[model samples]
Target chain A: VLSPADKTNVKAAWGKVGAHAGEYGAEALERMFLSFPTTKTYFPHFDLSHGSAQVKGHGKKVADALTNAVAHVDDMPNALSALSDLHAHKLRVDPVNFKLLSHCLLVTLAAHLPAEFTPAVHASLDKFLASVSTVLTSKYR
Target chain B: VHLTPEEKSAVTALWGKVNVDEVGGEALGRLLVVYPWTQRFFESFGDLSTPDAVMGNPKVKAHGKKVLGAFSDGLAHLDNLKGTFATLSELHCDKLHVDPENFRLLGNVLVCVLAHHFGKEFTPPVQAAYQKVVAGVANALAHKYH
Candidate 1:
């Protein structure tokens, strides 16, 4: 559970996300592919090669999805079902990738917000992303 | 709606100042009052008694950010997102019944707010490109209705 202060800080910082979403999203996704090369199999169709346009495009989508999920923290399950179905039925992704992406995303956020990202920010984002991973993986079965 | 290369970057650069979490809700709140019809789509602002009450609501803030994200996406995918624009037009026209006229108004109001927020940084090239940005968005939203 996030304290009021946590949400305040998180949302305040997050509000700035839409402006440079391409940069932030690109960094998070590039981190994901580099950190775990094994996840490349999931992108048979996508060009996840370093600095590719496809990676940047996927990164933008990641930011958009994260924005949606974070925006609807209370209703994450409902908000993410479309993405869950796309991953499960269409992309046929392994649910574990959600955890991988979440970790990479948190790292990206921490790097971006070095100062305001206190322990409280970590706690709220941890819970928020955990729920996001849970919802993204829920349809795996 | 065809923007010069320099113009495109200028438009994108100015969006960084919008502060969607702080002022996103207010922008939407202004939309609700100015457009009025958009209120039906957002349950959080459905019964907001005061004109700008949505500025303080968490739900509106979240939803507002998503909208801002969409705008960012549209800017990023200028040439490559025909499918997205198509889907958006179909959804608004068929599923949601949002009037295309309001999209034009949205174009105006959105540019107005961003221009106001960016202040001096919303310079000449940025202003020219931004006008095209809204025209492009308004054009895309008008697709299905057309």
Candidate 2:
């Protein structure tokens, strides 16, 4: 279990990540596609102009939702529920897309989190991601 | 997956409150419907195990279950916007783990859904209310995270 201080540290670390929403959003999606380039075809019909704009737009949305949810980390169900709604209801994005997005997010963090990305951090993030992923995946029937 | 009883209550409460005649209920209801449709579209994306297969596969199944879970939270808030916002605001200051930007993005989705559903009639107050709660949540989370 994470200590209170450790929890605080985790929140702070995430805040640092939140500060770079634009970069994180663009990079997260880019990395997902880079790792799985074929994903691009899924959005082939996406208007380049509209799509690019939406990327930034959607990025901010994710950032906001994430920020709020993270604050309520102790209430993991709430946090995961928020994200589940965005992908599942709001953006109407697919569950499979979340896995792709999570991969991108994790990959991006690995490349960017610096020394702060300790094993503990990794485990916490992975746990959080997995929990959220499970919530997202459970919807599949 | 099905929502736990608590989750279901939260979502249902949100829906009932937001859809009430007093607080943009008509518009909110319409938006709520539209919001889920989008989830349906995304649900076509398939499971995570076949990530590559669904990554860009237009035909993959969208994850509707996850979408329901997420929207339920938002719906819960709508049930008693002021109360929900206040509660969320406290949570933000106490336990948030992510960034303000993430919160902003989430707010944007809410805004977009409202606009998409209600058009220009979405009104400044409605939009501003959302921003207020979202920003409040973000700020509170920022304090905790930082």
Candidate 3:
């Protein structure tokens, strides 16, 4: 549900987040685990500890996933269809967990992009995350 | 959304002092103002064309209080969240046709309201705990679909 201006805000903010994608993802995941420990159940094998290489690597994968969503912002459902299928059927992740991670991601972005995170940008970024989350959880029954 | 006794205490302690009725209205009003798209759900509430109109609407306050009161109920019965919110879940998902995403949005908006009011008192630990609470509420509300 992003408008043209909203999409512009997202892409521009994402440019600032580009090089630091992995770092931000790691921070977001760390925040999620520390904040909502139950989410760790999906990654029982992950190191889960702060600054763990495995956590960082998985964080990269998550960042890559979001970057992919950014690139296909207008067609996320089709763009992330495979990822959606995996999460919905294979991982069996409770859809609720998606919101937890998204929340942490927003907090991470705001912490890092204090100046860039104006109210409008925050709303756009939130809509972007919600869109991605909706696609990722599309197949859930 | 399982909480340790300490986390539970942190959340309960913070929630204890909140004026839910006031904050509830503030949170919902802020949600409508910030995310104008959310106003579609309140078409029947009248004159949401401007941010001021939306915020000043008495219906917004009444309904917001109801919504926040639901959160308070969820806090009280953390162990039985699904049961506590069963009818609401049905009403929202099955009847009102609300997108599950809005639950997450409102929950985050509520947290932002808390942070705005509490300032330094809203520590990371307390925020983390409250995150679990809101996530739990959002999950319970969306349970009817899953």
In order, the Cα lDDT scores of the candidates are 0.65, 0.51, 0.83
Candidate 1's C-alpha runs over 4 A off are A1-6, B1-146
Q: Encode model 3's per-residue lDDT on A32-126: one tens digit a residue.
A: 88877888898888888866899899889899988988898888898899999998889988888887898778777766675676556767887
Best by lDDT: 3
- Candidate 2 positional error at B80, Å: 60
lDDT of 1 by residue, A41-116 (tens): 8777887766689888878887888788767766778988899887767877777777667655655565556554
In candidate 3, residue B3 scores what lDDT?
78
User: Residue-wise lDDT of candidate 2 within A35-141, one digit each (tens)?
Assistant: 65434434444443534866666567656655665687777666667556544534444345566777787777777888768877776666555555666555433
Q: Residue A9's C-alpha lDDT in candidate 3?
A: 92
lDDT, candidate 3, B13-113, per-residue tens: 99999999998887788788777799989998988776568767999988999989888877888887888898999999778999988988888878767
Residues B14-128, model 2: lDDT tens digits? 3454422222322222222333332232343443233344333333212222322333455444434444345544444334322234444444554565556567655665555
DockQ of each: 0.01, 0.07, 0.17
Candidate maximizing DockQ: 3
Docking class of 3: incorrect
Q: Please identify model 3 stretches exceeding 4 Å from their true place.
A: A139-141, B1-26, B34-106, B113-124, B132-146
- By lDDT: ranked, best first: 3, 1, 2
